[PDB]
Assembly symmetry: D2
Homo-oligomer: 334 residues x 4
């Protein structure tokens, strides 16, 4: 009884969500909409990936349909989201991943096309936010338009939940070293509002502002107004790292922090929060499906009330698998 999923947009997030859905098998993709990509170019884009390698399976085109592993997928080329016929394609849930329809009113145009529920794979101004393993039990089936937050928020949340539940985070500041994305420029180029983001991504470090640490306070209501941070965008390909500097209410040695993080990663947060003690680097987490992996040896503690914790996350795969897991939990709640 798997749900039927349509995907709006065939960018990086849409292709990786389709790849995660075909790898895991939790949901079924039945429709893809993109106005600027044709069918053969869709075959070429899905088959070959510079970061995650070739697709393990068969992908081709037949009768105007995209056939992946023997499953045909209807292709739409509509630009207006209210004109996409999701209903006759059989799609029940719609993943909005273009990054330009993030409000409730803009993403609600998909409901006119026959879709039941819309999941935004981006931060939203007014839609409710859900992070898997932290507050996903708060979903109550009467919400039609929700938001899965972002990759950085998905990495920071579970981690901050365990530390807050065991030791009481008083205040903290986060820094993330982030890999390049699609919005950056190969060489110095014109960025309208963010002047730093228009500089050459290959040659530069590029400090940037982010709101994921503030969105943790939306995800965890007890931490509202206690977290903030910024980011650095370094010239790597896929893997990012989060560094959280926090002050604790209760005394906590580093071995106690390691023990409670390992215990959380084993039982309750299995598959969402990881734990390692090896001498790992960034490329050791390529195509890793965890939201965040705690690096025990990389962190440092100044005293019993002031620590800095290090975590890793694949901002492409882990996030797409969280979209699939959230969609599966949504389908189980009907």
């Amino acid at each position: 009884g798997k749900v039927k999923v349509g995907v709006n947009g065939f960018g990086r997030i849409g292709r990786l969500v389709t790849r995660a859905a075909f790898n895991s098998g939790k949901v079924d993709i039945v429709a893809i909409n993109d106005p600027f990509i044709d069918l053969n170019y869709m075959v070429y884009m899905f088959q070959y990936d510079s970061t995650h390698g070739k697709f393990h399976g068969t992908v081709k085109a037949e009768n105007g349909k995209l056939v992946i592993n023997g499953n045909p997928i209807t292709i739409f080329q509509e630009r207006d989201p209210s004109k996409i016929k999701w209903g006759d394609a059989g799609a029940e849930y719609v993943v909005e991943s273009t990054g330009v329809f993030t409000t409730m009113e803009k993403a609600g145009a998909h409901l006119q096309g026959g879709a039941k529920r819309v999941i935004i794979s981006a931060p939203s101004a007014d839609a409710p936010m859900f992070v898997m393993g932290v507050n996903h039990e708060k979903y109550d089936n009467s919400l039609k338009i929700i938001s899965n937050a972002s990759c950085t928020t998905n990495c920071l949340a579970p981690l901050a939940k365990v530390i807050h539940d065991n030791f009481g985070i008083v205040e903290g500041l986060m820094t993330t070293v982030h890999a390049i994305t699609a919005t950056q420029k190969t060489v110095d180029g014109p960025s309208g509002k963010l002047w730093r983001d228009g500089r050459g991504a290959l040659q530069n470090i590029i400090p940037a502002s982010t709101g994921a640490a503030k969105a943790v306070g939306k995800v965890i209501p007890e931490l509202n107004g206690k977290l903030t941070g910024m980011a650095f965008r370094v010239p790597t390909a896929n893997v990012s790292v989060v560094d959280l500097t926090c002050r604790l209410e209760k005394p906590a040695k580093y071995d106690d922090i390691k023990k409670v993080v390992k215990q959380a990663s084993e039982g309750p947060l299995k598959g969402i929060l990881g734990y390692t003690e090896h001498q790992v680097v960034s490329s050791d987490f390529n195509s890793d499906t965890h939201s965040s992996t705690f690096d025990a040896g990389a962190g440092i503690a100044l005293n019993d009330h002031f620590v800095k914790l290090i975590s890793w996350y694949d901002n492409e795969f882990g996030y797409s698998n969280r979209v699939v897991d959230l969609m599966a939990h949504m389908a189980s709640k009907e």
Copy 2:
């Protein structure tokens, strides 16, 4: 009696042409047109460069004009080239560098605005092509719309001219290892016609097709139909290299080739064609104003009639300085 130059477009080529014109002092920039860049963003773009460093001088904004080294520059934000008032700004020559007006009819819209002559900084389908030091004596002042060719053609033409004049190139094939440009994508992205150019520029090698070796036959009419080639776009920043494999009519040892190339680089082609015998690499030619520099130690000869020659070129600076030099020679011919 320096000519007055307007620049259409403030991309990489336009900014580097303005920088070369202010560094050399051969011409005077009096006007810049760009519809998507405002004045303060123009100040920020011209002041800071990731590749060539900070501008040696003063740049600011005063009374709606861009003041560089005390010289004010009028700024236009028109989109239609026929609506730009080049005449009241005092601009006599116009450098068309946007890359979208390359035909004679499209680039002739600048003549309606009061411009006298238009120089296209791109290959053109029907405008006459000129390369400095090779065929620039063929300019006869009755041509209004001409094309300066491209960086690769400017690198290949002087070396091919010297080798053909001394030994008689029978046929040849060229390969260029090229640095990234602006049209590439930081990560796998959607390229309409060129599917290979949409892949991630940081992770890939990306073979590509080019018409520069064919345009050498337009520049040198005796070599028509004797040259062709392709290119590779590797993840470096600025400097490219040309590798020419050719068959000669007359016997030629490698020392004779080195002698005639050095003698050409000293007297006739001084400043256009360089010569080195040191153990150089690509970053040794950053901000070098030569069109091409012959690497004596990097080439190899199989026999007396079959050689492979290696040359270096900064595809940003050398080319912009050639645009300025062509404009100066055009102004001297009036």
Copy 3:
């Protein structure tokens, strides 16, 4: 009846040969010698790889032995190759991969330790060279010390064999765009003999001299004295590309070249020489086991007697799998 293989040196070639031997299952690794790597560091090196990802299997240390997939491996830390006890470890063949014992006299010290045959994974001055699929039928079991040539030679050989057999290569030059290796320097550093190789590998293009195209004439005796070339070392990670410019004796259109290369890649050279018509880039050949893959769309022909052909090769995996395949064919000939 698989042969027992010892590996001398745990560098990049030795680890990739061990990985290919455990992935394919054609031979059995029973011993590894390295004087500067201990057992736990060997576990860490074999488990984690930046280029080819994590090892698919189990690797650990037990009772002073390296246990991979339940198979224990004896570890030696001897420096003198004549003092390694290969015989009591059960090793019959020895892969010499340190890169410092390449002559027959230096690599013959392994025969004193009880080894039967020595395979050098490097070009050799006086040992016979063999390339799989080209001249591997010339092995006659009375040779104790042979050489498997190099990755570039393994890519160029089969390709040049097909073109020479079908159209008669008169003369040809080769250029290879090569990924960075271990001998390069992260930043400008001191290289004793090769001054260009001491420059910073991340920032530079670095022309270099190579002898693989000359070693093709040793592998194919009819092409002796007809091939030469050089190389460029660009800042990528794993995949290299070979560009061969040649003159043919018989007339050959490009479709005929494509047809004979595809026919060779299907029947006789299956698994050694590949063929593609897609719009591929370098990262599409990561962890590909082919020696060379012909890129049909990337090449160009000037006329019927002067062509340039493009081929891809993973210089790490394909070469190690060729070492394993040569060892298996050697074991079958006893």
Copy 4:
């Protein structure tokens, strides 16, 4: 009355110290010692630089001496530091930059050769540490062997001095995003003690441990035991950034922090501590001689008592110029 300086070692630090000494003119280099670099290779190394470009001046070899700008330099090739004849070469101060003689006993071997004072360009276990602009007034001429600390400490010190003097740092944590160095490996390689440092520098992020934040407490005695941190080594070329998260005793808005940092950068710490409000990136600080530049727009404050400050530093140039400035202040105190 400039002092005579000998340099031990011609690595990155030694060459950049020689370049800074010839650019600034504060001291005179009279001797260079290196056992593995000959004279012509020294000419090649000093003339060409991938990061900072070609040397602005003349460098050649004459009569066994290295002639830079008409100044001859004696060359030694001794390995034992006690066997170098610094005295007959006229050298009064000696910069120990090889990185292997950092204790007082090991670096005191240069005093047997006729040197007066030894400056170690590295952190030292028992030699006194001095940072220019912070505690350089504590030098008292009776010390023979001192240490100039490290680049990270030189960036963090002045900044922490101003914040501690104006607002009273209670405790703080530091993270630095550092460019690749010489100790890293182009590809996965064998690192004896630091297993993470042996991984491929081009592909990885590589968390690492550092002691510069602890050495600030040696430089500023009131901050002893209040600072600690770690580092990340990203694949860029030259410029690093320091990220300091601290808790303040007195209330401080961000505008007050900006005001006191700008006032410190103008008057007392001119040339040592910089200040900017532009939208800068890392390559804007290439060849910048400041120890640290405060980025006003990149930092963030959670409340009045918990801030995160961002600063930039060229870890190659700024540090070498600090070595020259410390040597000049040492020479003025005689």
